[PDB]
Design a protein around this ligand. Structure first.
Ligand SMILES: C/C(=C\CNc1ncnc2[nH]cnc12)CO
Ligand SMILES: C/C(=C\CNc1ncnc2[nH]cnc12)CO
Ligand SMILES: C/C(=C\CNc1ncnc2[nH]cnc12)CO
Ligand SMILES: C/C(=C\CNc1ncnc2[nH]cnc12)CO
Ligand SMILES: C/C(=C\CNc1ncnc2[nH]cnc12)CO
Length: 155
């Protein structure tokens, strides 16, 4: 099954600066802002599209990871497409979750993040808890990275 969602967030951070934090600097920022995330390591590729990363965290007192794939990036247009494709951190009911993100100009020099999310389910139902847990992880990452930029504009 495929379940699609759209989400929009406003930010006071300027678009290029927000995009940079959420892309170029994300691997450095994420362990600093999400306590359970220990490290991010590239396991395939060189950093360009097709690159797979392992995001290593502690869960229930043990190591765990998810696999993140970079699908596409278009820096001039502030777009970034990626997928969560495996690991213990991806719910067993899901083949993957695909994301297509954009950062747009917002009022007063700020930005609007828009994301399109597709849950690829192994069966034909998407658990509300599975959906909501994924939302909170992703939106939590967005807000924690934005919060870091807001706290540390000269990072
Ligand atoms: C104890 C550690 C890893 C071994 N245990 C596990 N590591 C990864 N996933 C799991 N699920 C249940 N137990 C584990 C890491 O310190
Ligand atoms: C990884 C990137 C953006 C992530 N964007 C979002 N991440 C999580 N929730 C949202 N709602 C609106 N935009 C988002 C790259 O710009
Ligand atoms: C409609 C709902 C969840 C689906 N939304 C999202 N699901 C997964 N990742 C995200 N990032 C931003 N929004 C989402 C309700 O919790
Ligand atoms: C720092 C990195 C990824 C962070 N993004 C995510 N990491 C783990 N789960 C998610 N769900 C939505 N976005 C994510 C690696 O480039
Ligand atoms: C959100 C999650 C952990 C951390 N969330 C946040 N963590 C750290 N700072 C923030 N500012 C806004 N939201 C956050 C859930 O995986």
């Amino acid at each position: 099954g495929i379940f699609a969602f759209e989400n929009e967030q406003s930010s006071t951070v300027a678009p290029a600066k927000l995009y940079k934090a959420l892309t170029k600097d994300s691997d450095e920022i994420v362990p600093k802002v999400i306590e359970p995330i220990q490290s991010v390591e590239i396991v395939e590729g060189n950093g360009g599209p097709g690159t797979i990363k392992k995001i290593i965290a502690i869960h229930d007192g043990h190591t765990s990871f998810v696999l993140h794939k970079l699908d596409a990036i278009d820096e001039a247009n502030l777009t970034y497409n990626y997928s969560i494709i495996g690991g213990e951190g991806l719910d067993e009911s899901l083949e993957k979750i695909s994301y297509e993100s954009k950062i747009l100009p917002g009022p007063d020099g700020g930005s609007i993040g828009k994301i399109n999310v597709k849950f690829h389910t192994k069966g034909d139902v998407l658990s509300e808890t599975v959906r909501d847990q994924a939302k909170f992880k992703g939106l939590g990452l967005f807000k924690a990275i934005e919060g870091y930029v807001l706290a540390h504009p000269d990072y």
